[PDB]
């Protein structure tokens, strides 16, 4: 039939042909084919229009439930669950990444020895159609398991109390078929930064939506070579990359992306924000950046300008790779063969990541302290490399030295760097609570 969907978040209208809704509103949708915007009809308000498809789930599905987070990893479930204000027994249900087919109940806990921690309980999918954590207490569905452990601890660490708070996500695109937008639809209001290609502003699209807008001085790039680059970038879709929403293509080129108010990593390492970062948090930020770049690597594309100034920070120490060097002077981050011969590859990005690692372990200090752009290039071509920073572990510097091999083909992959940094204090995230309480 017409499928009835339930809204998972509020959504405010942006254009003349999309549809406002509130969390829990049921919407009829006839063609729910894979896509980013669907045509909906509300049976509450009678109103019609396009809605972002990641804001709804089929009524009566496990995806319609507030506590089902789906394809989130153990890392990222712990990022949300370890938010220090939410009480003992805050929880979510997700898929297991250790064992295919199986689910996982992740619950915040607290102990006098270990403090605030997260416990993970394997939810067995009985091959005949049931669910359990222990085989003495079985359930027909995940929602009966959760209804149950909300009243009874019964071998869990805590009774399930509060549904894990998440933030309402981005839509994919600003609107159904919005890409090349008119300059009039953008209001540049607040200055975020200035660069060697353009300015970065905070503004609004259509009066309604917060966006970030990056401008590029005319002459940087012919709009055609730019537009070809921007649609490659538009195809990229990852939790650890900033989304490119829209573009003003004529000259002066605008690039419209997701605004992130906490700002750059570079500014975040410094001062009041960066005085609460310890090694564990800095290694966590590096691992997220490596995740984003591992996707870029998988997608056979290139950043060309990776550094802490081009990483943006979100809630719970989220880091996203931003400002792709689509128009490619940060010579201190540029691989020798990239600066000398114009050879920008995923391998020159690996070099830049090594330089970004010294920024993360030095509270944001500038690379090659006391060298100028010309000095660095000639010193680096001689084989010079920054020494291990004070307060940086020798094994993180060993990682930097692998990133800084002279030959691009001896530099490791972003898959390797992600694995290394996710495993650093030992982890692909393997620890489940056994079945042996009351």
Closest CA to 361 of 303, 285, 436, 416: 285
- Helices 414-422, 346-360: inter-axial angle, 10-degree rounding: 30
Q: b or e along 321-339 (b: 16 or more beta carbons within 10 Å of the residue's beta carbon)?
A: bbbbbbbbebbbbbbbbbb
Note the resolution in Å, 1 decimal.
Answer: 1.5
Please list every residue in the chain followed by a chain break, i.e. its C lies more than 2.5 Å from the next written N: 328
Whether 6 has a binding-site annotation, put simply, is no
Whether 24 has a binding-site annotation, put simply, is no
Whether 200 has a binding-site annotation, put simply, is yes
Q: b or e along 57-69 (b: 16 or more beta carbons within 10 Å of the residue's beta carbon)?
A: beeeeeebbebbb
All domains of the chain, ordered by start, with CATH?
1-64 (2.30.30.40), 65-165 (3.30.505.10), 178-263 (3.30.200.20), 264-424 (1.10.510.10)
Whether 19 has a binding-site annotation, put simply, is no
Question: What does the angle CA 376 – CA 382 – CA 386 come to, to the nearest 5 degrees?
Answer: 55
Whether 196 has a binding-site annotation, put simply, is yes
Whether 410 has a binding-site annotation, put simply, is no
Residues in the chain: 438
| First CA to last CA distance, the chain | 46
Map residue 92 onto helix, strand or coil: strand
Rounded to whole angstroms, the Cα distance separating 86 from 366 reads: 37
> In degrees rounded to 5, what are phi and psi of residue 20?
-60, 140
- Helices 346-360, 394-403: inter-axial angle, 10-degree rounding: 150
| Cβ contacts of 286 within 8 Å, gap of 6 or more | 356, 357, 360, 421
User: Which DSSP letter does residue 376 get?
Assistant: H
The DSSP result for 180-233, as a single string, is B--GGGEEEEEEEEE-SS-EEEEEEETTTEEEEEEEE-TTSS-HHHHHHHHHHH
**Alpha-carbon torsion (239, 268, 91, 434), positive or negative:** positive
CB-CB neighbours of 404 under 10 Å = 22
Rounded to whole angstroms, the Cα distance separating 169 from 167 reads: 6
| Cβ contacts of 405 within 8 Å, gap of 6 or more | 411
Rounded (to 5) percent helix, strand, coil in the chain: 30, 25, 45
- Give the CA distances from residue 219 to residues 22, 212, 222, 257, in Å, rounded to whole numbers and listed in that order: 45, 22, 7, 22
Closest CA to 212 of 314, 128, 303: 314
H or E element at residue 27: strand 26-29
Asked if residues 345 and 415 have their Cβ atoms less than 8 Å apart, the reply is no
> In degrees rounded to 5, what are phi and psi of residue 241?
-125, 145
Active site residues: 305
Task: Determine how β-strand 91-95 pairs with β-strand 68-70.
Answer: parallel
Whether 198 has a binding-site annotation, put simply, is yes
């Amino acid at each position: 039939m017409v499928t009835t969907f339930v809204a998972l978040y509020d959504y405010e209208s942006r254009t003349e042909t999309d549809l406002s809704f509130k969390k829990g509103e049921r919407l009829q949708i006839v063609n729910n084919t894979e896509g980013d915007w669907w045509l909906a009809h509300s049976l509450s308000t009678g109103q019609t229009g396009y809605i972002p498809s990641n804001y709804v789930a089929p009524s009566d599905s496990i995806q319609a439930e507030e506590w089902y987070f789906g394809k989130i990893t153990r890392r990222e479930s712990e990022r949300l669950l370890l938010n220090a204000e939410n009480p003992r027994g805050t929880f979510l249900v997700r898929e297991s990444e250790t064992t295919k087919g199986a689910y996982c109940l992740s619950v915040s806990d607290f102990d006098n020895a270990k403090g605030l921690n997260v416990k993970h309980y394997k939810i067995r999918k009985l091959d005949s159609g049931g669910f359990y954590i222990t085989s003495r207490t079985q359930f027909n569905s995940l929602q009966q398991l959760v209804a149950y452990y909300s009243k009874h601890a019964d071998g869990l660490c805590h009774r399930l109390t509060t549904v894990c708070p998440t933030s309402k996500p981005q839509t994919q695109g600003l609107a159904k078929d919005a890409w090349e937008i008119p300059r009039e639809s953008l209001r540049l209001e607040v200055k975020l930064g200035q660069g060697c290609f353009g300015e970065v502003w905070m503004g609004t699209w259509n009066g309604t939506t917060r966006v970030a807008i990056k401008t590029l001085k005319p002459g940087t790039m012919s709009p055609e070579a730019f537009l070809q680059e921007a649609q490659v970038m538009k195809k990229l879709r990852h939790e650890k990359l900033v989304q490119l929403y829209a573009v003003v293509s004529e000259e002066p080129i605008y690039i419209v992306t997701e605004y992130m108010s906490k700002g750059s990593l570079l500014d975040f390492l410094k001062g009041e924000t960066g005085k609460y970062l310890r090694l564990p948090q800095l290694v966590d930020m590096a691992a997220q950046i490596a995740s984003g770049m591992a996707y870029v690597e998988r997608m056979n594309y290139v950043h060309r300008d990776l550094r802490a100034a081009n990483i943006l920070v979100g809630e719970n120490l989220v880091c996203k790779v931003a400002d792709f060097g689509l128009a490619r002077f940060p010579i201190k981050w540029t691989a020798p063969e990239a600066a000398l011969y114009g050879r920008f590859t995923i391998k020159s990005d690996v070099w830049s990541f090594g330089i970004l690692l010294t920024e993360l372990t030095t509270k944001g200090r500038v690379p090659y302290p006391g060298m100028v752009n010309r000095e660095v290039l000639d010193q680096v071509e001689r084989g010079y490399r920054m020494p291990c920073p004070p307060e940086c572990p020798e094994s993180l510097h060993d990682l930097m030295c692998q990133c800084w091999r002279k030959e691009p083909e001896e530099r490791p992959t972003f898959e390797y760097l992600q694995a290394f940094l996710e495993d650093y204090f030992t982890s692909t995230e393997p620890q489940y609570q056994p079945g042996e309480n009351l």
